[PDB]
């Protein structure tokens, strides 16, 4: 039992009206800035942030003009979206005698906005990854913070997985006006990290991966066991996940069994509409191989086994290579996920809804010349988000799947048994750097460089398949180097070494042909 | 406890494996939060340990490399400054030493140079003050960790005015345990309240884009005063130094500042006063005077309306090195700046015979020493140990007195010192912006107040308007003192306007621009 320690009114207003708000913020730029806020205020009626500058008021970043250029901060994880910025307009906390007195939240917070979540992709990829992480970097918010949704959508279609991130109720922005005119938090985190993220949606370039991916599948898969705990989720099958409202496997029975006889596996059916998500997790965690149409609901393949298999379908016109998000998750470093693209190249499999409304694919609404236009092209060409209507007008067919052509294009990756051999899942690390680096030269002899250095110290303790060492040797005064991959810790240059001449030596160890480690100090030799 | 040397430690770890989770997309703005980050004395190497609870964000890959993980100074990319670990599995424990534990929380961060009060304050004390509050629990239970490896310097009595906990430095890790394990541990410093470079890419001078104001260097002043026991018959102060670069003519300093501003004057120095007196004085001091040189970091402690009155010796270019000017003319410091520069030869003393660390020439060659005393203004250059900049930046000086009284006062008319101070804010988004169109084409606009400016007094608001063709890269600017306008000048039929409406406060307090509107005609 607890104590259910409330706010002292008198003395939270009398810190605010006296000390204002407080705020410290990392990063440089606004796209990976994370701030705490002390005493931030919000306006139910004007539905804007404030900051009061009051005797202890700290403003960290104090942008001046910048702060509006764009703004302070991202508050969801699409990059720069300029309808997801975070801001607060600034009012001396004196000015707090004009306005109703304010009504204190003494959760610790955390503000942010979700991008679209009636989409289960965007839920897990924008919201609940960088949310699980985020509270994971302050000390405490893990534990107690509240998350407040402030993009303005309702629950949505998965409410229930966001409070699965947090034991205290989310509440949504809707939902402020009735807690009173004037909330103050006592104490407000505002930001989600991107750090988690891998794909970008195509706003600025065609939609494909992140430039540069900073999360590795050992970390999603955290995330996953984290969930897997929160819905209580502790004979080897292939799993089909099916859609039954659109983008539909037309001949789905036949799949099921084609697979169960070329793979002698059991086969099973997955569905968001017809199974509790809880059970879906389950079903997916024990699959030995994930079959499905290309969209949201392959994003449950990170909650995979280590060593299954990943096939995506695509239907007619769609070509597999631009459109990945389900492709980089699989090919993550550390997800050890096969992967596997199957795309319907034969136009009578597949079936068009030219009629139906926009959203949904159709292309009715065009002119004639258009819709002629779109018919004839068999690929989607790289586009820009959001509505294109070739896009739209493909994704949405529906597919007859040519069994023996997805049986051979999954057996030029999966040649024998699908899903986990009980492999070791070895770690894969780097080298340290090379220690206590000395030459010499020659000991009327030809010109000798010789070279000794001592291993990486982190290779005392590790047990490594291939160790190598790169090493470079640049003459004095030229900008080019000649590379030479050793095995041994000693060596002696004799060939295009010149007498009286100077050399810079630079060593580094790669573990397995791939693991480069990092130099060391240079080493200058004299012939 | 400081140190422990737990089984449910033990086995989080060897289970476990080490947890880091940071922010930032870079190396040079990288803060990171760790669990179970461990640390070899023998090696001078920190260890990630690769467990089944293990957490690596960001995970780089050989990018860890390039140059490396984050920055542990704040000096921005520094190639010995930086911070990396080594990598192991976590059983690989079997065959190390069994691990010392710090319990306690830790900010792990690298002096740049504790023997200088300049690079103390700017380098090491405002970023740790601030860093610590970015993360709860951290301002009143971590012990810093110094890793740079210099001794404790002649500030080291700052650094613990920041923690209540005893500092450690790197080389008196090595007595505590052959292998050192943080439980809790952040590494990195925020930059965020940097304002100079010290030259080592390009000339000295303030930073690119300063992120912090006076408001925020007084606050952090504010905590150091209550400290240090200052708490809150006008005088000015003439910041003195003892050793090197003398101001020749003090005694007649003093006399002819205190006559001309009709004002008490009182030295003081880092020698012969202790600290806490120092910043006592400075606190109340109307303006401060004193050489370039370190001593003027306290100037942050001055009061708001307080002038800065800086001395640079001959051959000085004062716009060359501003540290002091920048931190004085910070918006939000409320100091007013001046600097004065000795342009006579007869009035400086040079030191040749001195060792290059005060800016002797002697160990040059002959060709160098006559090109150095030959010259009359100190060229641009980089770090470090330039000497012809050492030489004249260790010159002394007497000061001319009618010309720096002249100096003063083109800036400081009548008295100095303290006035009311308003702090500036920005602006709201204006509201409901609409618009009507219209023959000859016409195009009506207005808007209501931002909702902040219904609780404010300002003396000038305007509305700027850019009106911009849809279709077009460029558009025309307004300037307008009403809340709604109609355009008539070069506005066509059948076409589409963007309306783009930001107000502006006193001139210069521009706001944001509101949602587009879009008119058509
Ligand atoms: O037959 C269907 C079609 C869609 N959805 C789900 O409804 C949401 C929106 O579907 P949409 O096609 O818009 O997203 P996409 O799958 O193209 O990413 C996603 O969570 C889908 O998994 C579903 O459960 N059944
Ligand atoms: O006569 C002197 C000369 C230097 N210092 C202090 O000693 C340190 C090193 O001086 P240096 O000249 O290297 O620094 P600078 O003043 O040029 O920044 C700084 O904290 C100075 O304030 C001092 O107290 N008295
Ligand atoms: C602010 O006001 C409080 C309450 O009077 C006071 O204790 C404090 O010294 C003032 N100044 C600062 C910088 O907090
Ligand atoms: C799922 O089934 C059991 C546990 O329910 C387990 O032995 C099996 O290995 C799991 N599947 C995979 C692919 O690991
Ligand atoms: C190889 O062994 C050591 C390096 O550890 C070195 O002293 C020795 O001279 C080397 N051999 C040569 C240079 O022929
Ligand atoms: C790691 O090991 C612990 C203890 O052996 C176990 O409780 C836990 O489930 C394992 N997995 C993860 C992801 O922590
Ligand atoms: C100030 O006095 C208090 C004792 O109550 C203590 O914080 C500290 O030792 C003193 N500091 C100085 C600089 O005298
Ligand atoms: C502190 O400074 C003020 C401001 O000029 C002045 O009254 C005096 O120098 C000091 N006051 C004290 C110590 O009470
Ligand atoms: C235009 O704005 C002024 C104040 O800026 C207001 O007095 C006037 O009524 C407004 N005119 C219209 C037509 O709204
Ligand atoms: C809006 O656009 C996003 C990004 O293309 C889709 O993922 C989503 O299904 C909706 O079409």
């Known amino acids: 039992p607890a104590p259910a320690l409330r706010i002292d009114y008198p003395k939270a207003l009398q810190i605010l009206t006296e000390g204002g708000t407080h705020m410290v913020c990392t990063g440089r730029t606004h796209t990976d800035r994370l701030c705490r806020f002390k005493w931030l205020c919000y306006s139910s009626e004007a539905e804007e942030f404030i900051f009061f500058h009051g005797n202890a008021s700290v403003m960290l970043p104090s942008l001046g003009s910048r702060r509006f250029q764009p703004a302070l901060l991202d508050l969801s994880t699409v990059e720069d979206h300029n309808t997801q910025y975070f801001n607060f307009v600034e009012l001396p906390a004196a000015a707090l005698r004009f306005m109703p007195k304010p009504v204190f939240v003494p959760d610790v917070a955390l503000i942010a906005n979700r991008f679209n979540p009636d989409n289960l992709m965007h839920v897990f990829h924008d919201d609940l990854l960088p949310l699980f992480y ?4 302050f000390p405490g918010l893990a534990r107690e913070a509240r998350l407040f949704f402030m993009e303005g959508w309702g629950e949505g279609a998965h409410f229930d997985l966001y409070k699965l991130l947090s034991p205290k109720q989310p509440l949504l922005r809707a939902q402020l006006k009735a807690l009173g005119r004037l909330l103050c938090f006592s104490h407000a985190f505002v930001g989600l990290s991107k750090v988690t993220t891998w794909y970008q949606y195509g706003f600025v370039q065609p939609q494909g991966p992140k430039a540069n991916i900073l999360v590795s599948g050992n970390e999603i898969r955290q995330f996953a066991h984290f969930l897997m705990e929160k819905l209580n989720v502790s004979e080897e099958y292939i799993l089909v996940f099916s859609r039954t409202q659109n983008r539909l496997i037309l001949n789905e029975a036949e799949l099921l069994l084609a697979l169960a006889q070329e793979f002698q596996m059991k086969t099973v059916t997955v569905s968001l509409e017809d199974h509790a998500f809880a059970d879906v997790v389950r079903l997916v965690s024990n699959a030995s191989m994930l079959v499905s149409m290309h969209g949201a609901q392959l994003v449950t393949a990170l909650f995979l086994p280590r060593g299954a298999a990943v096939v995506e379908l695509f239907p007619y016109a769609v070509n597999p290579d631009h459109y990945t998000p389900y492709k980089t998750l699989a ?22 809804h030219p009629e139906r409304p926009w959203d949904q694919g159709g292309i009715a609404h065009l002119d004639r010349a258009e819709q002629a236009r779109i018919l004839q092209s068999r690929e989607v060409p790289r586009h820009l988000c959001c509505r294109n209507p070739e896009w739209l007008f493909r994704i949405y067919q529906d597919t007859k799947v040519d069994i023996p052509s997805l049986i051979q294009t999954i057996r030029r990756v999966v040649k024998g048994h699908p899903g986990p051999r009980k492999q070791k899942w070895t770690v894969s690390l780097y080298p340290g750097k090379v220690r206590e680096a000395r030459c010499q030269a020659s000991v009327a002899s030809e010109a000798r460089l010789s070279v000794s250095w001592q291993i990486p110290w982190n290779l005392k303790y590790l047990k490594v398949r291939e160790v190598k060492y790169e090493v470079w040797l640049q003459e004095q005064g030229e900008n080019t180097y000649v590379p030479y991959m050793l095995a041994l810790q000693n060596h002696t240059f004799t060939e295009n070494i010149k007498p009286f001449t100077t050399y810079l030596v630079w060593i580094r160890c790669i573990f397995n042909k791939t693991l ?11 012939t």
């Open 134 to 137: 985020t509270l994971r970097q």
């Open 516 to 526: 480069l480690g990092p130099f060391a100090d240079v080493l200058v030799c004299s």
């Open 331 to 352: 090919t993550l470093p550390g997800m050890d996920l096969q992967y596997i693209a199957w795309q319907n190249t034969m136009p009578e499999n597949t079936v068009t």
